[model samples]
Target: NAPLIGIDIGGTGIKGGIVDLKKGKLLGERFRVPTPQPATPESVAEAVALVVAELSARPEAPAAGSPVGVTFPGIIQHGVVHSAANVDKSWLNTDIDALLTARLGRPVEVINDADAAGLAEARYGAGAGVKGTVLVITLGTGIGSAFIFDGKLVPNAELGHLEIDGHDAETKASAVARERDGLSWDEYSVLLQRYFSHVEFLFSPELFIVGGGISKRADEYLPNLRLRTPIVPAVLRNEAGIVGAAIEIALQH
Candidate 1:
């Protein structure tokens, strides 16, 4: 069987890789391209097409006409994009799945990026097995969340928009928040603790998995954050969304 191609569309870049499912690692090489500035829906689509085409042309990636899984940052349901918080404003209501499918001439499955990453963590990474209720929070350019109950995934939960301390939780606790507000890791962790405690109070989740680039510095923040739930770093590191997108693709077919 051909390896799955997983594409993660982020605010600043579009990335993809071939997945060796049995080994649980990316196969040959990974590709990334800078997203166009002032990213409109059309420009974003063009960027994705460019990246996909570039990867597909490579010997390692799945060739053209192969199935692809795409992870977008926002609410997606049945191929329709309902929101675009992290990207350009024009992405709202874009039928991204159909557009990509038409452009690429391949079967495409669209899923929320955070949900895809959370799914990967739940199945094969940090939250693997030993599950009751797990909450996966991704604190990157924006906050993304996914909830898992007994291994079942609830996609596109949009927990980032939730208000904490009169501001969006993403604004207070995300990596973007730290950069945009010029907050130290200690300050960010302190805010995150309050956010996590509130989420625990509301959801009563048994486990909390924190993901994003900041996981590399887990020692700095994880030690200071206080919450009722058991918190752990996502085991998949930077590859969760890529792997999870592969999982989503394979599951669809």
Candidate 2:
């Protein structure tokens, strides 16, 4: 079985790794490159090409033309990008699957970054074995969310953009928001409680899997929040997006 390559494109960096489908783990160290300034389609595609080349050069890398899954920080519907929140505005309405396929010379699948991460958590990470609605939220430069129901992903949920108190929910509860406002862990937990409470009230998810770099310090804030849903830290952490992308492509095959 040939390994699949998964790439996660973020605002600051683009990372990729070859995945072992049987174990749902990356084969070795991941390859990453700094995202180009401004992150235009051309610049980012070039960077992706570089990362792909580096990965392909590795002795244990997947064979040429193996399936590749790439996670984008936007809404992807049938390989077309509809929104570009953290990425360059030019990405809107672009056919990213075609663009990257041409650059990397392999079949490619494009998915929302948050959706990819959630899929990973639900399948192999924290949300595994859960029987109901699972909400995976990544707290970073902005809030990214993925909603899973009974192991199936409801792609592009965008719950982070939900309006709360006349502002975007992420603007109030995101990690960046906490740091920018100099909020203490307890203070930040209050905002998270409000956001989580709203989500809980509407969806009543069974589990909330929190990812992103912030999850590493979940004890600082997660314990302070009070919500009906069972919230837990993501086991895959930063690797969720990469592993999820690989799993998605593997399923397609």
Candidate 3:
């Protein structure tokens, strides 16, 4: 299996790694860089280029001109980004893929971060071969979700922006929100409960594979929430984004 690159961009960090497409895992160690707070198209591109440079210099890096898969936190359509939550407003309608591709001199594919995680989980991780709809949600800087129906991704379902009690759901529901407001596990579950109530009624998925850095402590918040869909910790955890991003482009080749 050829090694390809996957970079998961978030409000807090940009995580990059080489991936084994066949195995749906990282090839070795990954690298992280602080995501610029005022994350502009220029700043983000430079940040990604830095990762590309570092990885390209590695002894195990992929050959020159190898495709790179990148994940964006917001909605991505044809390499253009629309809407901004944690990132800057300058990203609205920005042709981010062109920026990164030009900066790195490599073909780049940009996808929704949640969709990236969802695709990998469905294909090779927790939801592999599972029947019916599997919802893959990564709770981190924000709430990211992907709905997988019978192993196929229903892309760009930005349920994070759903309005609950007059609040952008993620603004009140993300892990950042929990820590910022000092909400206890039960208090956090109330937000999750309301959010999932909407998700459960709308999608009625068979399983929920919850992910993100918070997945390590699923016990703290997950058990308190009551949902009709059976929820489990994502098997791939932090690796899902990298694996998903790489496999997407690797298959295209």
Most lDDT-accurate candidate: 2
lDDT of 1 at 238: 72
Model 1 alpha-carbon miss at residue 51, Å = 2.0
Looking at model 2, residue 112 earns an lDDT score of 90
Candidates in order have lDDT scores of 0.83, 0.89, 0.86
Worst 10 residues of 1 by lDDT: 20-29
Which candidate has the top score in TM-score?
Answer: 2
Instruction: For model 3, state the Cα shift of residue 30 in Å.
Output: 0.3
lDDT of 3: 0.86
| Candidate 2 structure quality by residue, lDDT tens digits, 1-253 | 6788899998788999988877878988988999999999899889989988888889889888787899998889989999987677999999999999998888888999999999898888888899789999999878999999999898899988999989988888888889999999999888888898999999989999898878899999888888888899988876788989998897767
Better of 2 and 3 by lDDT: 2
Judge candidate 1 at residue 64 and give its lDDT: 71
Ranking by TM-score: 2, 3, 1
RMSD of 1: 1.4
Query: Residue-pair clashes per candidate, as listed?
Result: 0, 0, 0
lDDT of 3 by residue, 99-142 (tens): 88998898999988999899889888889979898888888888
Per-model TM against the reference = 0.95, 0.98, 0.95
Q: Which stretches of candidate 3 lie over 4 Å from their true place?
A: none
What TM-score would candidate 1 get against the native?
0.95
